[PDB]
Amino acid sequence: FNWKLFWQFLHPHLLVLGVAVVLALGAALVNVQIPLLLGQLVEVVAKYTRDMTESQNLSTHLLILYGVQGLLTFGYLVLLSHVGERMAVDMRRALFSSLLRQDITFFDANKTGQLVSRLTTDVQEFKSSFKLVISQGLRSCTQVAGCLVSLSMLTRLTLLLMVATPALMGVGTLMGSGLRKLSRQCQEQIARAMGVADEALGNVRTVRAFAMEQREEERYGAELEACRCRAEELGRGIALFQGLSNIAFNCMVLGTLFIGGSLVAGQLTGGDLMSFLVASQTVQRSMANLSVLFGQVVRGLSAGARVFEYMALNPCIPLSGRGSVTFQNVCFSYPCRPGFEVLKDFTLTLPPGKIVALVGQSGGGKTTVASLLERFYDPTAGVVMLDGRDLRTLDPSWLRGQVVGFISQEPVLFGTTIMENIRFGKLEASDEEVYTAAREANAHEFITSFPEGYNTVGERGTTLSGGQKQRLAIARALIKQPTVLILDEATSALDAESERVVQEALDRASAGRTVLVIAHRLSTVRGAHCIVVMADGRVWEAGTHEELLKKGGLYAELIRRQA
Amino acid sequence: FNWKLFWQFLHPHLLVLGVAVVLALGAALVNVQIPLLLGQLVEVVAKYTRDMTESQNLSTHLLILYGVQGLLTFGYLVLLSHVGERMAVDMRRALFSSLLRQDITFFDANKTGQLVSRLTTDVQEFKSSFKLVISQGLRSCTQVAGCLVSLSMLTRLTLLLMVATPALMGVGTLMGSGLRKLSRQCQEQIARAMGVADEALGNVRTVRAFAMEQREEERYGAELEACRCRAEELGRGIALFQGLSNIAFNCMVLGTLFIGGSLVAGQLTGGDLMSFLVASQTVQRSMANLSVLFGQVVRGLSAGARVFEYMALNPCIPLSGRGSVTFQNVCFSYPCRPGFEVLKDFTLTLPPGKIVALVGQSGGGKTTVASLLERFYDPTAGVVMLDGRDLRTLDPSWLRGQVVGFISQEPVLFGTTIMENIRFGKLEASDEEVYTAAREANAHEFITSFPEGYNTVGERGTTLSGGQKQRLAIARALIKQPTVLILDEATSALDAESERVVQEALDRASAGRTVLVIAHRLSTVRGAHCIVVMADGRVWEAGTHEELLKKGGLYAELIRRQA
Ligand SMILES: Nc1ncnc2c1ncn2[C@@H]1O[C@H](COP(=O)(O)OP(=O)(O)NP(=O)(O)O)[C@@H](O)[C@H]1O
Ligand SMILES: Nc1ncnc2c1ncn2[C@@H]1O[C@H](COP(=O)(O)OP(=O)(O)NP(=O)(O)O)[C@@H](O)[C@H]1O
Numbered sequence A, B: 001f002n003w004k005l006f007w008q009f010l011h012p013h014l015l016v017l018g019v020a021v022v023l024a025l026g027a028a029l030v031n032v033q034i035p036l037l038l039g040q041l042v043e044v045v046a047k048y049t050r051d052m053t054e055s056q057n058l059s060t061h062l063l064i065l066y067g068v069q070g071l072l073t074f075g076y077l078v079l080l081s082h083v084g085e086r087m088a089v090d091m092r093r094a095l096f097s098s099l100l101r102q103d104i105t106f107f108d109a110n111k112t113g114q115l116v117s118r119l120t121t122d123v124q125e126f127k128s129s130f131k132l133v134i135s136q137g138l139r140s141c142t143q144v145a146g147c148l149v150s151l152s153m154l155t156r157l158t159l160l161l162m163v164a165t166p167a168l169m170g171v172g173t174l175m176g177s178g179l180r181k182l183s184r185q186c187q188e189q190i191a192r193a194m195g196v197a198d199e200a201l202g203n204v205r206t207v208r209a210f211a212m213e214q215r216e217e218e219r220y221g222a223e224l225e226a227c228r229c230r231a232e233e234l235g236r237g238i239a240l241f242q243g244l245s246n247i248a249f250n251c252m253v254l255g256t257l258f259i260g261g262s263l264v265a266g267q268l269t270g271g272d273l274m275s276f277l278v279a280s281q282t283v284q285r286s287m288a289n290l291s292v293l294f295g296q297v298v299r300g301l302s303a304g305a306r307v308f309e310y311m312a313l314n315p316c317i318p319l320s321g322r323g324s325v326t327f328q329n330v331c332f333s334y335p336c337r338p339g340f341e342v343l344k345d346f347t348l349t350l351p352p353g354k355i356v357a358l359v360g361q362s363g364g365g366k367t368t369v370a371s372l373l374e375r376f377y378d379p380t381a382g383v384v385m386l387d388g389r390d391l392r393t394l395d396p397s398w399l400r401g402q403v404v405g406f407i408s409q410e411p412v413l414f415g416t417t418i419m420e421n422i423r424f425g426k427l428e429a430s431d432e433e434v435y436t437a438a439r440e441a442n443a444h445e446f447i448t449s450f451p452e453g454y455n456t457v458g459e460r461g462t463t464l465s466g467g468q469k470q471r472l473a474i475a476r477a478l479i480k481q482p483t484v485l486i487l488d489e490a491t492s493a494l495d496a497e498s499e500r501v502v503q504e505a506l507d508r509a510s511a512g513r514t515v516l517v518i519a520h521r522l523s524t525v526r527g528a529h530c531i532v533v534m535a536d537g538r539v540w541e542a543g544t545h546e547e548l549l550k551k552g553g554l555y556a557e558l559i560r561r562q563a
């Protein structure tokens, strides 16, 4: 999981990782070798000035070692970039493939934006931090080990200086610690003291209505005077703290610089000190690198842990697991907030080859009741029958792809061209079938005016009209010739002529197949066969329009309100 | 404005600012003096080791100078904290006082949260950055000047080294420049390549409904392969760039360290080089401080400019500039989005001492029409008459504080105790008047059960019930005994018993004064005198209830729908 899956998916790059490790070791070794050589060169130059024959050979040796260093670092970090990039691409592909299998509960429980952000940016940052750690931590640890070993072989004074160096680094970072403490304390004091202005401006209508602005002024002044006092003591305390930090820090610097040399004096090389004074900068930089890299590691491990936790799950319902359809005592509620119940013992049947509609001002979840047949959510109770067989035993993929077609009140378009976008239900689509379907759904006529035509991309491409988008949805819906059709508010917000055209297209398309339509305007339903009036969860009424007028139930009130 | 106002408001601290400047000069001078002394001490220690009588005096001198440095820095930054804190408090108070004068157009055009953030956090950060710049920039510039002068007086080689130092600093920062370029290029490539997954997950219902997940898989794989290739070339380019940066940087380091010494060799002090090698770290730190401080200055100046731009404005309508009230042909629309018009030639009058109501399912802006008499917004056309005098010539403060009382459907509570919160219309409130008003508005009865009582604070204090909150508002409104009263949905979302109690309280409170009430439920209006039915901007109907029933207009449809 957090480690086993990562190790399994990182296994096929072990050889390249080892080669990179070797290159890093070489680069760190040469980087360790450089500063001592530079110190010796500057020391011999200074001694020659005090009194360049021997400097040329040392300079050439430094140049050769440094060219080797450049080649080694180039090879290392190009290999590291290759490995990290390959790992990132593989992880992105695997995460997308595994996440695409989940049901709707995961999707509507969370948000799409955060999922996309985690899928792309979080894993990119994880890979970046991971390879940066691989480089820097190994390089710096090997640098520290090599320089310490060389200085010890060069005695105990070097070990004492190395031990003292971490204390000096901490004393130096104490300034930044004081800075963050100052910032945090100031922010906390500001948050605690303020709020009166926020409360006053939050409800400005009332404060303007009742006519005073003076009481707020002295209250705000008193609050700011209190925050003012607290600020004086906080600043004074921070001042004393930083002053003590500085005094102690440089007192320790001077004391060490004196005592260590005085004690080590009790016979080393004259130029040994000059060569020793340069490695301090390198070791200090290394410890700073470790200090920052600790935060890099913690952030990266947290990101990787959450990525791998959300990467591999178990689908709630398996995805790969010609007649009438009916319900029986089906009740259901949304998984989130089960207190809001939806279905009170809902029973309904669809005649095999007749038009069925449904209507209600709010219904009590008419759209979700129109759902639940595509196995979007399993029913809490009751049974659903289709062609004499239960939908549970039937494979959901077969029912999705060869039985039920779905039209929403908003169509969806992708960057793929229209010719392939229509070929979306089956990828085995031939040539002439696409044009025939487009002609049947009234899409070939207007697509001619487009300059590119069937090669036009979408959001980043040419924009199509709402009626054109509705026409585009219909051809894809009819490619499979579904036995059951579902329409959700086909008569959306658009003009009258295009609405009539698309209604006629649906009429000549919805022939010989059972189709269920959901409409809000009652003027588009009188041409249907049967009408079901919904109110308060349970079914309110169902029957023919001509008898529904004589019934005088809730439908009479609804049509009176609409008229 | 951006500078003149700042100078005027900073004027009364010039003496303290100058004293701080002097202290900073002293601290910078001693900080300049320290490194040369440390270099001389370490050089003489090394020379003694090569062959501590003279080291003690130099160490004592360093300790004395360094104690002086500590005292100077303490005094400087405590004075700086005092000055900055005083400036911040004064600016906050002035900004609040000036902003509180603005009309409602500013408030509803912008957001309260951003205003509060700018008022508190932006000015706090501005003050912090401003004093940090005052300290660091002066200290570092004086440090650079002093060290350069001392090294020159110590020759042209020092000037050459100082000139070369900025180039080395830039070469060092080239690594961070490459880092930011790498990050930006990677982010841009990720943003350009991605989007297919975002589009697929944005509409998951449709992609799940039409049954395919394969086509998305090869499209996503192709997109990731393209991004993969682009990543290989981008990483290779960054690799070569950083390799060239490093090779050139340390080649320049070695070349300078050789050539400068070789040329300067052509008779300085033997220990001069050791004392010179230490000031390089100080000057490098100073240039780093300037580099960061440039960003601090730009951010601070932007923040201060926006603060001062929004700090002093000109109110749209002046704030300090017994009978019936009536309208005449008053039309108005909201200043933002004038296309959405509201008032179509609205005429209405209020009898002096009778109950008037208004109702509508949406009205066309019934609430904003109920407004516009408190001078919240000036009328576009028409006239408003009150007691035979125009409201424009009358002082808005007098009308706000001694004429009109306002009750909203949501009450507002502050952290101030109830005893003073009731005393909100006038601060001259005596003792017994508050208790009498509380008893009249039915608030003294339930406040007894509270343990603290009239000393109870609110959001951070004890929580009161909705009916209790409504009762607080009636007493506050009753303090001034307004001649005109306005109620907006008194029968809010709450139980029946408390609704009846508060309605009775309003009835025994609304006696002898003209009051206008807005209600949504028609069951609370039949007891009024006259009813005005609103529909589609213009006035639809007005008259008595008993004749409105016989009229059979839109009121009949509304009451039929409600029933
Ligand atoms: N994905 C969801 N997650 C949680 N709650 C939901 C979800 N979808 C719907 N609901 C809630 O369940 C209620 C009923 O479901 P729904 O079928 O969407 O109502 P509806 O009246 O048919 N929609 P409409 O056609 O716009 O009037 C809704 O009012 C929502 O509050
Ligand atoms: N402060 C505002 N800024 C911009 N637009 C506003 C503002 N207030 C209201 N509007 C718009 O103007 C319309 C009419 O004004 P308003 O009086 O608030 O409607 P209303 O029907 O009386 N409100 P309600 O009592 O909840 O039904 C509203 O529907 C808003 O869309």
Ligand SMILES: CC(C)CCC[C@@H](C)[C@H]1CC[C@H]2[C@@H]3CC=C4C[C@@H](O)CC[C@]4(C)[C@H]3CC[C@]12C
Binding pocket: A172, A173, A175, B031, B073, B139, B285
């Ligand atoms: C770049 C950093 C992280 C390297 C680590 C060494 C740092 C922490 C140490 C070494 C020398 C120190 C500086 C020496 C001079 C004083 C002057 C005083 O007015 C403010 C603090 C200041 C400026 C010190 C801040 C901390 C300091 C910069």
Ligand SMILES: CC(C)CCC[C@@H](C)[C@H]1CC[C@H]2[C@@H]3CC=C4C[C@@H](O)CC[C@]4(C)[C@H]3CC[C@]12C
Binding pocket: A157, A158, A161, A165, A168, A169, A172, A256, A257, A260, A261, A264, A273, A276, A277, A280, A281, A284
């Ligand atoms: C022969 C032996 C004793 C030589 C030992 C010399 C040691 C004790 C002295 C000589 C110069 C000193 C360094 C001068 C610069 C500072 C920068 C600070 O950020 C960390 C400590 C550090 C890096 C000091 C560490 C100790 C130091 C290295």
Ligand SMILES: CC(C)CCC[C@@H](C)[C@H]1CC[C@H]2[C@@H]3CC=C4C[C@@H](O)CC[C@]4(C)[C@H]3CC[C@]12C
Binding pocket: A031, A073, A139, A285, B172, B173, B175
């Ligand atoms: C703390 C900083 C800002 C001080 C300024 C000097 C910096 C920019 C210079 C001085 C010495 C340089 C380092 C010398 C060693 C190499 C090893 C290589 O594998 C990565 C870059 C790296 C690590 C260089 C990075 C930049 C560098 C750190």
Ligand SMILES: CC(C)CCC[C@@H](C)[C@H]1CC[C@H]2[C@@H]3CC=C4C[C@@H](O)CC[C@]4(C)[C@H]3CC[C@]12C
Binding pocket: B157, B158, B161, B165, B168, B169, B172, B256, B257, B260, B261, B264, B273, B276, B277, B280, B281, B284
């Ligand atoms: C007598 C005269 C010529 C002495 C001149 C010595 C000069 C040329 C040499 C001696 C040691 C060198 C310094 C060694 C450390 C680096 C750190 C880097 O981040 C900036 C440049 C810098 C700071 C070098 C600047 C030039 C330098 C100061």
Ligand SMILES: [Mg+2]
Binding pocket: A365, A366, A367, A368
């Ligand atoms: Mg719905």
Ligand SMILES: [Mg+2]
Binding pocket: B365, B366, B367, B368
């Ligand atoms: Mg309103």
